[PDB]
């Protein structure tokens, strides 16, 4: 019925894990800093119309526990009627919050909703919340738990992606991300993090290594060789994939996503709420979809999820101008490209998590706003955003520029 439009899409810079600039900033401050930025852009915005604040978070414990979305509503001085809910669909939590907000708007029961994510991996490390799929032996043994990194090497092993093939994409991600920052592509959407006194803490994605060379990547060691050997996870993966003889471990620290801190926030609302608040729509949510695939390799979810959202919107691969898949591992992007036969020119055009980092709960909302900017910058129409999810899930979203 009522269409869902994106009015704003902002994010913080991503601070690295070791000696990072954002290590001293608690996760709640990253969300409040973005709420304050949304206030600066629309001072006349009646915040009582905002009925919900939906934040994705993958480790909702410690600094990120106790429904951090509601803590951000109260700490930022938002009206007490603005809701606040935390969700976790692993690495797609950021995009799931956007889809849920768009679906809440499309139901007519919500007018204006804030969606986003937040993840401070330097303060709240991944896996701090536990879980049965890993810590409960009965379910670990039955589901055949295999870490995502082992599934990424198995994807390169099955598809024949060599160490040079994945390092080639890793080099490209550093280049496209470096050219994106130098060209001012991110100046309007990356909100510098500042302290309570206004002093600058971080204004750029400090995980990037713009001087990356193909020779320097070949000198790195496979970061998941000891994990597969001491943990026996290679033997587990090959029992499910029995026709594969040996797993080729090709992923290192240079072709995998970075562990970083960051947060993102998007504003979604109906066309009636936009005209009532004087907001100009940037893009329209065309369709959302949730699918999945085998959880042992875990990282082949984007392919059936992308096909489903294309059928829901009644479109093909040729009808989309920009494809944005999160760069959890290099082989995931190469496999998604081979599955749907996507040209290399329209896939993660401004670099991705390999260069700028992967803040779990926030990444889905970060790359979504990244595509909103590129649609308006290139004057293109449609863009598709998808991420691979733990447990073999998949979420995809199609947006159209307005």
């Amino acid at each position: 019925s009522e269409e869902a439009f994106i009015y704003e899409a902002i994010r913080t810079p991503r601070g690295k894990q070791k000696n990072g600039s954002l290590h001293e900033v608690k996760p709640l401050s990253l969300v409040v800093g973005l709420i304050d930025e949304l206030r600066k852009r629309h001072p006349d915005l009646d915040e009582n119309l905002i009925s919900d604040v939906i934040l994705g978070c993958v480790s909702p414990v410690g600094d990120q526990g106790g429904d951090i979305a509601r803590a951000a509503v109260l700490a930022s001085g938002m009206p007490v009627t603005s809701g606040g809910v935390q969700l976790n669909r692993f690495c797609a939590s950021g995009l799931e919050a956007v889809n849920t907000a768009a679906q809440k708007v499309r139901s007519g029961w919500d007018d204006l909703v804030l969606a986003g994510g937040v993840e401070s991996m330097s303060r709240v490390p991944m896996g701090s919340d536990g879980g049965a799929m890993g810590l409960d032996p009965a379910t670990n043994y039955d589901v055949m738990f295999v870490p995502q990194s082992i599934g990424a090497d198995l994807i390169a092993t099955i598809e024949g992606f060599s160490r040079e093939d994945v390092d080639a994409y890793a080099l490209r991600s550093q280049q496209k991300a470096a050219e994106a920052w130098s060209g001012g592509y991110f100046a309007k959407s990356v909100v510098p993090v500042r302290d309570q006194n206004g002093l600058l803490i971080l204004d750029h994605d400090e995980h990037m290594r713009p001087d990356t060379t193909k020779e320097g990547l070949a000198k790195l060691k496979p970061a998941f060789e000891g994990l597969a050997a001491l943990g026996g996870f290679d033997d587990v993966a090959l029992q499910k994939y029995h026709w594969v003889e040996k797993i080729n471990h090709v992923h290192t620290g240079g072709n995998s996503s970075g562990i970083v801190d960051g947060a993102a926030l998007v504003m979604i609302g109906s066309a009636a709420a936009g005209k009532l608040q004087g907001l100009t729509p940037r893009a329209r949510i065309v369709a959302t979809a949730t699918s999945g695939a085998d959880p042992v390799i875990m990282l082949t979810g984007p392919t059936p999820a992308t096909r489903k959202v294309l059928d829901r919107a009644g479109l093909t691969v040729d009808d989309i101008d920009l494809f944005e898949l999160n760069e959890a591992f290099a082989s995931v992007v190469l496999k998604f490209q081979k599955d749907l036969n996507i040209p290399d020119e329209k896939l993660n055009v401004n670099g991705g998590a390999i260069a700028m980092g992967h803040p779990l709960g926030a990444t889905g909302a970060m790359i979504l706003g990244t595509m909103v900017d590129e649609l308006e910058r290139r004057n293109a129409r449609r863009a598709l955003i998808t991420l691979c999810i733990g447990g073999g899930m998949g979420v995809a979203t199609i947006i159209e520029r307005v």
Partner: protein, 727 residues
Amino acid sequence: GSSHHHHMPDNTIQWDKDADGIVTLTMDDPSGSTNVMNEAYIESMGKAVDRLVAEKDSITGVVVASAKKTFFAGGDVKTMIQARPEDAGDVFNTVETIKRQLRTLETLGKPVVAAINGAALGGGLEIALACHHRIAADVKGSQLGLPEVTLGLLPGGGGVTRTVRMFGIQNAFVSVLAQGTRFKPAKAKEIGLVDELVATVEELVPAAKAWIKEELKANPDGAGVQPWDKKGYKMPGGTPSSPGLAAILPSFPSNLRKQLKGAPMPAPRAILAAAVEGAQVDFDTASRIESRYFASLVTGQVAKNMMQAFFFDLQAINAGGSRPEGIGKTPIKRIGVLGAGMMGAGIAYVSAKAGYEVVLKDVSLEAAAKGKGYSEKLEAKALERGRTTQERSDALLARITPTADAADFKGVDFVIEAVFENQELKHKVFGEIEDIVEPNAILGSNTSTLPITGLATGVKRQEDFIGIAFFSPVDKMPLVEIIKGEKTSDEALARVFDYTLAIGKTPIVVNDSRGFFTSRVIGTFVNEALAMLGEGVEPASIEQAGSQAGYPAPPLQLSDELNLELMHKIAVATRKGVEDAGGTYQPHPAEAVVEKMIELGRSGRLKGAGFYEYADGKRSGLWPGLRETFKSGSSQPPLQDMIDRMLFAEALETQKCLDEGVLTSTADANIGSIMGIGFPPWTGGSAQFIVGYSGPAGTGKAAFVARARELAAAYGDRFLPPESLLS
């Protein structure tokens, strides 16, 4: 409703209280020579525990001792094997009642000492684990452990919950629970199963009373309190919520699935699940979780298979089931061995290790020194640095007297030939000392394929000629396949049957037939894999199907040790054996695959090239040329069809051996397939597999012939069930 009694048996516990107030519960089951956790024990322990609570005002300590040669050995196997899923409530209540009695004894407010005089296995050790102090008599033969996993069960009498509380999740699982390893009294004291050791059994109960008198005076506050019952208890290695253990905890089920190779053995999974789930809650709640997992195993089909094989079948073998009835025990003086190979020289090891004064001879003294050299650098170089009694290797080495053809084997009552499998060579070899040994002497032969009836014609006393087939390595393989010739006397079969027991091995009796039992049945397993490779199945899938089925080694890997040239010689010999008999020969589809591999010069590990690659004595991966040679990938059947094709081939063929009279009991078929053919233990044997099969068709013998006809309709008429199964 909630008591120490299960809802008129004989009493098995003797009550005794001294003037000091120490109660001595002496376990002494009248019906039997060993204390077993049966219905008589449950009622007797329930009464004794009720009395400990009633007289608690005049009791200061408890000593749990035994009157048998051993301490206590597990539970009643004959009852547990009959537990069906409809009896899950009765199983749950029974183990809850047993543990409730031990928990009451444990929280009695008084020190309880276990006087472990002999073996404490299974439920026996669980009783001692419920005590606060354990004293063991340092005597050999007193094993201690929880071997329930070997029967498809778990230590459901608190063994899982208490060892985890004592050692933590990782140590108790890896060292105690997952494999059910058994320990010597000195070794159990080392890890911490028992607390102190005594020299003699007579000094055991007085030491138990002495420890109680000292524990009451030294530690009166913590007297009779277990560590996990004190406030401030910290589990060794942490809880599942501890950051150190939670970091490595996801790797525990993966490493277990790595060791089991994906085989469907539910007991180790249930042990690990119960151990970790119990570590998250209080002791009593942990005990209850352990009971539900125990009931899950006993009512299952896999535990019935292993109890049938590793208890009933193995006990029937050692009971002389296949031994000739009514034959006396003839003595044995010296033994003559003729073999310097890996398997020939190993035969002289197990015989000299039991005291026999063997005489090895293999051509000239050079090969005999090499044959004696197999025991050398291994009888003590890799053995003296071990456990106990390493200074007694003289009687185990001075007995073996290696010589050559100069010695005529003077005064030898037992001959075990182990030369190369050659008919004409084996005839004249035994004829060199046919009239030189004792007048009454056994003439054994370690043959694998040649008919033992034809070999007996090379000697006059054919009634004393018999096949005695060992397995490499002889020091580690426990099965001995005894092949009965046409004219082999029952007195000879009885003498060889008694020899295998003194060696410590497990014998099976087999009538002279083509391929006997082990070699004939293992051939169908290997041939089924080679046929799948010719059909176009990926070689990686075939190796995974073999490992996940339960076999200790995948089939293509096994086809490299069993040289392909030797496999081809078996094929041409079976053809000439049935054609010269008048019939017509139908080749197995695996032969065309073998003939192609030998054509490429890849005969196996011996040459250094086969289905795998080999370099510097180490096995590499599969040969990359297999995918283009046999069109690997053009055939993708379900993995369970690959597994069943290998399991049913050995199941149908072992049935034919029973039909043809090759085997005389399913106990020989089960134990023979487990200890010689490598058949998966979770099946309980190649014969138990047909009565305990479980799949989408159902369960039992009727489901077996249904799945067999399904495999026959899709993979060839060779999977049709025999008429003896009544289809």
